[PDB]
Amino acid sequence: NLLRKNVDTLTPDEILNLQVSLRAMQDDEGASGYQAISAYHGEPADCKAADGSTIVCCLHGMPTFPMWHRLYLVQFEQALVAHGSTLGIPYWDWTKPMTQLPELVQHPLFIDPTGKKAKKNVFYSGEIKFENKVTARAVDARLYQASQEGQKNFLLEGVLNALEQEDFCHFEVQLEVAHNPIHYLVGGRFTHSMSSLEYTSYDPLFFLHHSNVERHFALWQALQKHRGLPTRPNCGLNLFHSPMEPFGRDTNPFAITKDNSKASSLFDYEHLGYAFDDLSLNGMTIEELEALLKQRRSGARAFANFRLGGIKTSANVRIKLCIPTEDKRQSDNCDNDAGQFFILGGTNEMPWNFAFPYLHEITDTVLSLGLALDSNYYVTAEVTAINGTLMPTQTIPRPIVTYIPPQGFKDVNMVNMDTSSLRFRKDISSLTTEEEYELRVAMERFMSDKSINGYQALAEFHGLPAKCPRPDALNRVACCIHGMATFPHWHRLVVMQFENALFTRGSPIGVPYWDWTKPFTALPSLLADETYVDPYTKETKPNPFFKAPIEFLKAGVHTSRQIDERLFKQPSKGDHGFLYDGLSLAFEQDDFCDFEVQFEVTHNSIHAWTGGSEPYSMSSLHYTSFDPMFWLHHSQVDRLWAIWQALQIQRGKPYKTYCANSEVYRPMKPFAFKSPLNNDEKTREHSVPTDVYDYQAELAYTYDTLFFGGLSIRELQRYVEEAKSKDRVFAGFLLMGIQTSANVDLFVVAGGNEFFVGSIAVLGGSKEMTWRFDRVYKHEITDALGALGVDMFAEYTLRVDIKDVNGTALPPTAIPPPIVIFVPGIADANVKFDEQHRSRKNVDSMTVSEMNALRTAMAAFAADKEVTGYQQVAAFHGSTQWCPSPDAAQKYACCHHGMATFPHWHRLIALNFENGLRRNGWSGGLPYWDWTRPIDALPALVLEAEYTDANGEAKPNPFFSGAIDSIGASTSRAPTEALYEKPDFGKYTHLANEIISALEQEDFCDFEVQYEIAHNHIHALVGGTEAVSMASLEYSAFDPIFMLHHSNVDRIWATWQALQKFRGKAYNSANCAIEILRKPMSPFSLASDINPDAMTREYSVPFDVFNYKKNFHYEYDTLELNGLSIXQLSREINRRKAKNRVXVTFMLEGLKK
């Protein structure tokens, strides 16, 4: 152990030793010499990086800064000791308030106690041999403080704030930033001083300083040891596996550093042959320090968020805190300054950008001015070059305020239920042909023709007629928000504009969305078809969604989305789909901005993907909004946010943009404009996105489903926990906003060969608004590494190749090099309530994997012949003597009909089937199929006799008719009647009508008659000539289709209830036909022995089966009917009820036939 002590605590003998020894190495021309070694850091630039010209050898701004410099300390230290030097390089604690530079360097000509004479002095200055002469340091007044409170110790504040962060990445950015002030302040206006990274190493005070920053590093890693956090760098692993020059170079004097030139070996410093005396700043126990820090965390905080990079110079950035001006006059209170920091840099600097935002805490001064941390204010930056020259604000991306609420805090609630109408945005596939035609007409009229209130204006809002900040004057950019936390607010508003525009032109629907998350083979016919036929005129006219003119240019310019490439099925990636993967990762996060980066750049992919190389396509930020697809596209984008937001409310965590709070108060670019530039009241009202968060309250719309994948929001929650419990590794991109729009391809390179892990797109344009992300974009590289047979920490690099959408070559330098991130996962929740929840969807929307998973379970269900097993519950339709026993004689078939209690009993049946099916290997709820909607063929699940399993397979089926009774010992065959679709353009042929009629009446029984007799239709429709089918209820239940039927049947019974809730009448109870409503069911109530289900055992009485929500714990995909929402439904039945009509009545008695 070489010893590194405090500089002030040195003994005159220790000091004499240091002096004579550093003098000794000062007269060394050899590689152990001061010149040769100081030449490692700074000018002359001997290293070469990327494909660049000669560039400074030292490494700054990267995660490798601490390793490189701790190793530089080791090299200098051993080079010292090569001339004893009994001690290692001392640290001077500059978090300790200062009056002057350490006395060792205060004055040249140090006196020996044996004087004699003089001098030397080696600590005062080290000669910059080449390019003479030496350089003293012009100190700044800021270095010396603690005098009368303010200025508060900001050096200490820097290292203490860095010491607080629990990631290596964050710690690294805050540490390097906090280490820059000494360089700057000691260096000063002199070019050649510690102030520039060109020559900062030639000054002994540099080594005395980095001794201290190293002590900070060791202190941090030690504080990480206590108690359960990694001391490993989890950032930018690629730069770890290469020799950091000139330490790996063949002429390196000492073997200890050459054998340690790899940054990978420098995570711990025990093998380096040095040690500090104390490494605890300001007389603080590690327990005291961590107490102070973890209790500095608690409460509400506010930070100046800065996005830093190499500016080719050193600079002081002063932080001014601003209070916004209401009026035209620039009266913004920027008087009071909130903070300060420093940046080291130079010419021939290594190009660099922190992958994470630098945060400078301003909470205290924000508290000083008496304005809430939550409220609106902003932060501006005064950049003074080290030259003393005041610098343009453009030099550095503008500061932001980051707000940390008191955890945990629930943001304000949404407005209760629904009333009385909201615009419903559906899946494009969920649209009936009628709806397609009507929003086609709306779009047709809005687009054709042109006005200020017309399509082209709104298409112009987003990009390239460049009206931002104002259409005047000198320099104009696109208005849309990109590379910011406010992107989805902006585009949400935009989609609302589109919505109003289409509603006023006569469309019943909100703007539909298309799930690109669902794997799709081709574009939806809605936006794919060249033309379409008007049902009335039979005239073929343009599909308004295929193309759209670009008016403001005078030529034959139309939208050309012609090229869509790289997506459609393979390569990327895919667990399900590339988009699905990206968005999954997006939905994973708790914090807003973290989610937002993933959100946005995942969405960018579909832009570049569908746009292709076409200049007037979705590829270019300029013209992408002219393409109609946009509008539907971002409907979905909006919906995505919606889902995410819902997640948060289930997570119990805040859903508003607190990560970037100041930016929420900037008025949305083209929306806040007065009446000529924007004529939409609502959107202009929400030109401040603060009220934009509430889903349906302020903006008055909602979606049909919030389901992502096939997952419910809680099912999605379960998924993200499962994914979060695995050890993952990512490749992070700092997307900086290059002028054009581009595609980058990502490669993992092990030994001698590279692997394609994925591709991401950066959306932009020539006249784009300058944009830059605060955080880094993580792309899952884990499965790559898994398929590479290469471990997490094993040696591999990343390659990118960037090419513009137009197809020209882009230098790999255009975007900062991606970095590797390691994330270890863990969760205590669940424990959750996932066992007691179910979601019921269409079998027609199901995925093949879900299909197979469904089949298997049923095979297992049908295998068991008595008690548990499907045959028993289907035999609840099966007439064994359970009708009033033990004295039961001649009667009868036990199945609750009669008919008052039909809905109840069959609810219970479908529930028994469901639980019996989940018991045997399934995690989903019993699905259904919309027979209200017209049907060409049976659902894919039942139509074929044999199906192909994952590895191939003989017919089970088991969801085929072949399901046997074993009582009569034969298969329940299902035929088809020559049916069912004759619907003209309108309206609601067959079942739908009937069902709607049923929904009309207020009374339970009056509803139930129509309801059930409507339900009989299918029993008789899939029930063919063959009596073994569903046509007769002796054998009816045994065909698995039954389950689907009286799933959907039940759903109607649920929808009705919803209506009854909306209508202000009794829903989970009834006052008609009480006698049977009071009697427990025949098969469900018999015993614990007769049926498996415990809940159907407890809930036998019809009164209890009324409330399915709380009791049976299952919700449906939707309660829509033939595309109609419940509110819409009410409007429709009232509309029918308003007309004068005759009706015919039938008195029905039960006959066996």
Numbering used by the authors: 1 to 411, 3726 to 4140, 7455 to 7781
Extract from the study:
Some animals such as molluscs and arthropods have blue blood because they utilize hemocyanin, a type-3 copper-containing protein that freely dissolves in hemolymph for oxygen transportation. Subunits of most molluscan hemocyanins consist of an N-terminal segment of six paralogous functional units (FUs; a-b-c-d-e-f) and a C-terminal segment with a varying number of FUs. Ten copies of the N-terminal segment (FUs a, b, c, d, e and f) thereby form a conserved cylinder wall, whereas the C-terminal segments form several inner-collar domains, located on the inner periphery of the cylinder.
Type 4 molluscan hemocyanin (squid type) is exceptional since this is the only molluscan hemocyanin type with an additional FU (FU-d*) within the N-terminal segment that usually forms the cylinder wall. Therefore, we constructed the entire structure model by rigid-body fitting. 5 symmetry that is shifted towards one cylinder opening (northern hemisphere of the lumen). In TpH, the FU-gs form typical FU dimers, but in this case the dimers unusually occupy the northern and southern hemispheres of the inner space alternately [cyan FUs in Figs. 1(e) and 2(b)]. FU-d*s do not form dimers, instead single copies fill void spaces between the FU-g dimers. The segment of the wall FUs (a-b-c-d,e-f) is invariant for all ten protomers and there are two different possible conformations for each FU-g and FU-d* within a single protomer, thereby resulting in four different protomer types, namely conformers 1, 2, 3 and 4.
